[PDB]
Amino acid sequence: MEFLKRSFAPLTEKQWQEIDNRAREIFKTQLYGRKFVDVEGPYGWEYAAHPLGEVEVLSDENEVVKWGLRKSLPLIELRATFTLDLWELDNLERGKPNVDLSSLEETVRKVAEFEDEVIFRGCEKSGVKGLLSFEERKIECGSTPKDLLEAIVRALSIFSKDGIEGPYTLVINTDRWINFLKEEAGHYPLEKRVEECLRGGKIITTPRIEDALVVSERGGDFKLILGQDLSIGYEDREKDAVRLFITETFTFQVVNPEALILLKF
Amino acid sequence: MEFLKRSFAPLTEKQWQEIDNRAREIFKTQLYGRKFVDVEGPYGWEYAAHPLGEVEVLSDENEVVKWGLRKSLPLIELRATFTLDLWELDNLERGKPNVDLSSLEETVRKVAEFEDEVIFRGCEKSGVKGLLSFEERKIECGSTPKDLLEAIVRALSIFSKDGIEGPYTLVINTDRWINFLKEEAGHYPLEKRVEECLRGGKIITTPRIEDALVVSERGGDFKLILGQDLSIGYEDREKDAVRLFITETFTFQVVNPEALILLKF
Amino acid sequence: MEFLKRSFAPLTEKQWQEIDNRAREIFKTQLYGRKFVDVEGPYGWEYAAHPLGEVEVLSDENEVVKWGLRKSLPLIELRATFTLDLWELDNLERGKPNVDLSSLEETVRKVAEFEDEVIFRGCEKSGVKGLLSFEERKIECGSTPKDLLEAIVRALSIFSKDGIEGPYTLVINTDRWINFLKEEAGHYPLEKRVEECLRGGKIITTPRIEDALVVSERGGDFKLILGQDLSIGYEDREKDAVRLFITETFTFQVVNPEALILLKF
Ligand SMILES: Cc1cc2nc3c(=O)[nH]c(=O)nc-3n(C[C@H](O)[C@H](O)[C@H](O)COP(=O)(O)O)c2cc1C
Ligand SMILES: Cc1cc2nc3c(=O)[nH]c(=O)nc-3n(C[C@H](O)[C@H](O)[C@H](O)COP(=O)(O)O)c2cc1C
Ligand SMILES: Cc1cc2nc3c(=O)[nH]c(=O)nc-3n(C[C@H](O)[C@H](O)[C@H](O)COP(=O)(O)O)c2cc1C
């Protein structure tokens, strides 16, 4: 809201709607992690830390009053700025239906890639552990279309041992998926065989990872914690151009790593 | 209920709900026998024996008053104890969403494997005869995907001879199933061909057996008799830890072995 | 509440009321800091951190997506255990009006002294800065009853420069106060002259500090942040005795150090 200073940028309401609409479209398809994790919040611009429900004891062993500090995950605040040419935006008022927003588009994709980098590969300085670091959840079959279907059936038996119900979802690197389709030399559609072995599951292709993984979407196992959802604000004018910024506050927690299986081809 | 002594364990209601929930999830997927047998009861903590409807005659051949004893199946009571660390459980109150229940999980899987051992392999001392001991219900085709489909069509013709209607269900070792899928080198999905040859039946993969079997689920042929369903109780504290236990009372009876066919690969 | 496990200690309701009453009486007079700071909360047993409203920037200077971590004060959780003799407590049921609670009293005073140690001298490991560390708020007159009254008039003129209204309160070491009364050799009551120079203020004597200070009580300048207020719980029995514990979660923040003046005699 008001902390974004939007009402001080020299832009008409229609020009704000054009900027917001384009950013929303791109975030919808490029925030790959949000396609299968749980999203909590938003808790607001002031939210600073998410409790871990532990105490780190700091007193000496023989103190009458023993004490320690409660532990929490600090939220990450990101800010990515970009400039738009003001004359080009004014053509929207003249009726132009395709004003150039390339700088916005470039920045939106960098932010999307930053968030997915935390979800998948974690952030040491913030104490976030990403999905791909739970190495003990890794199984290894091979690099052949048959190897993939077997790995999926094995994965669902491992889930069964831990009492993890479905629905189940395969997340797989885009190029790998394409390579698997090429091998299947004119046959029953591989995509259909995969949905079957997932017992009616989903397939999400992505460039964010190099192999694949299987997750349960029963809910409550992967939590994206949002303070402020992705928003666009105003910084300052710089003659002919307006400097805007994208911002959000968030952190991430793998609650139950049993709902996760890493596939190594 | 009250015989479990739950209200004497030093645990909050929320901590009891966490223990119970996790055990329920695992029992749901690991009690393989319950997925296709009939479940009678529960008849209560006091139930001691299930009548067989026979008399064993013990008098001599030339007695005026002839007599014998009614026969019954005695119920099996099992108890499996395990300890939980009390400080770790108290973190649940601090807001921790993933307290460590590994000891519970380990014990729940041992109990699940005990029950399935009675259903499938029987219990001589209790007089239970398990599914896999009815050797006269065994047919033998071979170890090839085609051999399996043929065996299923033959099985359903044997059921027809005995007047056993469906729906029919294939229970098959997990590794065997995976091996059958590997052989079927990129073709129409084997799972679809199997459901067809079962006339719209079901497939249950399991590690509890080494080959496979086909059963009718018309009802009334395989009875799991429950006194007390699986429950968690409290035994005693032992400094920093609470000793809990899992318990149930039950027995098992194959009423109509005609509703059962054993496959030998 | 339920996380304190109170209902598992073998004590009657009347015996709990006796323990709680005695602890309350002592905390009322021995928590000296609470006599003039603001008390926020309680926010609950789960509260873990209090936001500072800042961001620590961690990205490199030339990154497209710049980022950092929100900052907060982690709450301190303290726990102090103590044992009570169970036979002695049972005399309360026999009608005894003065059962021996010396162990409770000793522990309550250690906890009270711990909290006041944070408020006055801070806690480096938790990042709390105590009242007595704001050295730039220190003025120095001398060690004579006249020096004290002058220091107070000077203090209130310094407050006026910063726009800090009253009412004003003098916090002074007990022995110092007694020494000032001895010097005033039979005259108009020093306590009356001090209240006058404070413009109708208050005097709080305490052993927690070695000199004195003057604070405004306008409100909103010294915040004690409470998660869980001081509470008594149950740990375990140990034959003839019950082991109880005192606990709280809290932190402290000097918001406006202009509302504070340190006196050095
Ligand atoms: C996380 C972050 C937050 C910032 N927030 C503000 C702000 O609220 N007000 C301000 O005047 N400058 C702020 N700055 C400094 C710059 O003026 C500007 O916001 C710019 O975004 C700097 O970083 P960026 O261009 O990479 O996004 C912030 C910088 C960072 C790195
Ligand atoms: C089937 C079985 C039932 C038992 N029932 C009780 C009981 O009801 N009360 C008791 O004090 N001890 C009982 N005990 C003895 C032990 O105190 C405790 O229950 C423990 O469970 C022993 O067996 P376990 O640890 O393998 O489960 C039982 C033991 C077994 C083997
Ligand atoms: C801050 C602190 C919190 C503790 N909380 C628990 C708890 O919640 N449950 C438990 O079984 N033990 C807990 N312990 C460990 C001991 O069992 C017991 O609580 C005891 O209080 C140890 O510290 P103390 O005697 O100095 O208070 C805690 C210990 C500390 C130092």
Residue numbers in the entry:
A (entry chain A), B (entry chain A), C (entry chain A): 1 to 265
Paper quotes:
Many species of bacteria and archaea have nanocompartments, which are protein assemblies that serve as non-membranous compartments. These bacterial nanocompartments, which are also known as encapsulins, strongly resemble icosahedral viral capsids in structure, although there is little sequence conservation between these complexes. One major difference between encapsulins and viral capsids is that bacterial nanocompartments have binding sites in the interior for a specific peptide tag found on the C-terminus of cargo proteins.
At this resolution, we were able to model amino-acid side chains confidently and identify ordered solvent and ion molecules. The structure of TmEnc is extensively stabilized by 22 ion pairs; of these, only four out of a total of ten ion pairs are conserved in MhEnc and only two out of a total of 13 ion pairs are conserved in SeEnc. Because it lacks polar residues to reduce the energetic barrier of desolvation, the fivefold axis channel may allow iron transport, but the rate is probably slower than free diffusion.
